[PDB]
């Protein structure tokens, strides 16, 4: 049984019920259509969440500040479905580029475990400041099939 993928919600249910749940009860999460997008997180001085829609699926994009930053992508779907994708997270700044590429986690795997193992893009504040505008950080997120 699947739990709410948003990084104060104690909702549980089927996999097919996840998207309806997010749409009705978390109306404030923005969704973007496209396989190559910019996740522009504002005021990095905390969780930011959006959804990216492509290849007929929805991916939850999360940036968390615990200081260190963790950026991760998770498929609203099964592990089997997730294994058909690759995601890329890129920070770009003045003649510097940091890139992280992996298989998206299923929401069943959650992101606590991936975060605790630094299995995602991990960067600290000095780095965040370095790629960021005025406390705004643009992450280029690209999803592809394999």
């Amino acid at each position: 049984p699947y739990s709410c993928p948003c990084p104060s919600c104690k909702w549980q249910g089927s996999l097919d019920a996840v998207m309806p749940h997010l749409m009705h009860q978390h109306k404030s999460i923005t969704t973007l259509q496209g396989e190559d997008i910019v996740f522009l997180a504002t005021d990095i001085n905390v969780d930011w969440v959006m959804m990216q829609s492509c290849f007929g699926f929805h991916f939850m994009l999360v940036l968390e500040k615990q200081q260190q930053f963790f950026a991760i992508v998770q498929l609203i779907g099964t592990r089997k479905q997730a294994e058909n994708f690759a995601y890329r997270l890129e920070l770009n700044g003045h003649r510097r580029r940091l890139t992280w590429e992996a298989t998206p986690r299923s929401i069943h795997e959650g992101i606590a475990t991936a975060i605790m193992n630094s299995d995602c893009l991990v960067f600290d504040t000095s780095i965040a400041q370095l790629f960021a505008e005025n406390g705004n950080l643009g992450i280029n997120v690209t999803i592809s099939m394999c």
Partner: peptide, 9 residues
């Protein structure tokens, strides 16, 4: 590319 301007929770 499309961009989403995202505020913090």
């Amino acid at each position: 590319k499309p961009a989403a301007v995202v505020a913090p929770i």
